[PDB]
Coordinates of C-alpha atoms in Angstrom, one line a residue:
X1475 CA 127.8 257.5 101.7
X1476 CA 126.6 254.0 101.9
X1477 CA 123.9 252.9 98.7
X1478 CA 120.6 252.1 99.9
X1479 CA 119.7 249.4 102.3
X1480 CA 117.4 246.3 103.2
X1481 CA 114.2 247.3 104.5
X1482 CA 114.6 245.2 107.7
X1483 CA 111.2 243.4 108.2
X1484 CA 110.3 241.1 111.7
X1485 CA 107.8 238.5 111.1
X1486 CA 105.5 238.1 114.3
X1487 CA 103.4 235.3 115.7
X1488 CA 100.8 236.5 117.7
X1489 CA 102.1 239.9 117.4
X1490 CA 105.6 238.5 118.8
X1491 CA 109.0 238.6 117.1
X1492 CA 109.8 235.2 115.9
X1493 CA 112.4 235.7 113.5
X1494 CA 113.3 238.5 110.7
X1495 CA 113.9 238.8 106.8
X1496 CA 115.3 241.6 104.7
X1497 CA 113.6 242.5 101.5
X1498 CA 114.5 245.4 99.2
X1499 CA 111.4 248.6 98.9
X1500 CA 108.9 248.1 96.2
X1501 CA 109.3 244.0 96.4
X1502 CA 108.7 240.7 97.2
X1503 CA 110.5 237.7 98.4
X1504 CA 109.9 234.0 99.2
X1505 CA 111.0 232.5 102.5
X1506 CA 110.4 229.4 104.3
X1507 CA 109.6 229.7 107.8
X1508 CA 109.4 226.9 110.0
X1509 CA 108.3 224.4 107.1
X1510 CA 106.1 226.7 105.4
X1511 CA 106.9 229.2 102.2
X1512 CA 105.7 232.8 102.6
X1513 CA 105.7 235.4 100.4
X1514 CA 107.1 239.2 102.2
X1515 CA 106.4 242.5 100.2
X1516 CA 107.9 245.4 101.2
X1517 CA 105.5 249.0 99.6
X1518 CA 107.3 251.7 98.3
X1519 CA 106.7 253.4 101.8
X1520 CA 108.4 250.9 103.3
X1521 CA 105.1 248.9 104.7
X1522 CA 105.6 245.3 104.9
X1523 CA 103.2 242.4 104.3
X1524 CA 103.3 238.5 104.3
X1525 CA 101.1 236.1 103.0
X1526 CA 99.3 233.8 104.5
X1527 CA 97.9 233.8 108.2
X1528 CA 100.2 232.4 110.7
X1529 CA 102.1 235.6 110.7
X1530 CA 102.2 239.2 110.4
X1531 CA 105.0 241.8 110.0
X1532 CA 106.3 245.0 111.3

């Protein structure tokens, strides 16, 4: 009975996949994509969201 896992998140550009992150429910995370540093919350539900407005996430 495996412990709880990544919420799996896929950053989109222009509502296309361009790369994925995993970040845990209830938190955030940096990354740097491409050059640039982002900041990718997860909600409780499991809703994702990014900063900034290059990208969105699903």
């Amino acid at each position: 009975h495996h412990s709880m896992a990544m919420t799996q998140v896929t950053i989109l550009k222009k509502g296309e996949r361009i790369t994925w992150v995993e970040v845990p429910k209830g938190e955030s995370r940096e990354f740097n994509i491409r050059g640039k540093y982002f900041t990718v919350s997860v909600s409780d539900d499991g809703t994702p969201s990014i900063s900034g407005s290059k990208y969105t996430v699903e």
